[PDB]
């Protein structure tokens, strides 16, 4: 569980995001596929794009980004209190896409490489530990619904 401090922590830079979701989006999707090059063949949509510069050049992929990001907002933003926002994700995610546990904690590192990159003054210790603690406690729970769903992940 989460302290209020933490999820403070959390929000903090979460607002660092928001000031550029596509931004952010795009080099957290490219840096999942560069480092976990299996994880793009999850998306029949994406998997045309062979190079990182051909990824970077898709303005579809960066929609995509934005509707990532929005979804784990709109989580993150409900402090542990985020059955409903979890629900139609785990469901997908579990029933059609096939994501497993693995790939998620692939791109939770993704986002924290990201959010570093992004963020030299700003992305310490502290603030990684709890988005460390906020996206584990997000791969717990969608883990619980991937079981109640009867998906191994
Ligand atoms: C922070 C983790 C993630 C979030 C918040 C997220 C969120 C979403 C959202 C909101 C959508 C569109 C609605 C839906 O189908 O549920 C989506 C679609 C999808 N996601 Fe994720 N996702 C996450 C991780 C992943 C990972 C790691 C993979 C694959 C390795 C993945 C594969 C897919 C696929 C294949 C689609 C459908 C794309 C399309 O063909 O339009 N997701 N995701």
């Given at each position: 569980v989460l302290s209020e401090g933490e999820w403070q922590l959390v929000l903090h830079v979460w607002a660092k995001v928001e000031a550029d979701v596509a931004g952010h989006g795009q080099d957290i999707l490219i840096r999942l596929f560069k480092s976990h090059?299996?994880?793009?063949?999850?998306?029949?949509?994406?998997?045309?794009?062979?190079?990182?510069?051909?990824?970077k050049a898709s303005?579809?992929?960066?929609?995509?980004?934005?509707?990532?990001?929005?979804?784990?907002?709109?989580?993150?933003?409900?402090?542990?209190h985020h059955e409903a926002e979890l629900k139609?994700?785990?469901?997908?995610?579990?029933?059609?896409?096939?994501?497993?546990?693995?790939y998620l904690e692939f791109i939770s590192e993704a986002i924290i490489h990201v959010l570093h990159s992004r963020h030299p003054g700003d992305f310490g210790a502290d603030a990684q530990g709890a988005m460390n603690k906020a996206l584990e406690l997000f791969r717990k729970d969608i883990a619980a619904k991937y079981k109640e769903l009867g998906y191994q992940g």
């Open positions: 090059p299996e994880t793009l063949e999850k998306f029949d949509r994406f998997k045309h794009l062979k190079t990182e510069a051909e990824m303005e579809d992929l960066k929609k995509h980004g934005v509707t990532v990001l929005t979804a784990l907002g709109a989580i993150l933003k409900k402090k542990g139609p994700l785990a469901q997908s995610h579990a029933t059609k896409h096939k994501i497993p546990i693995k």
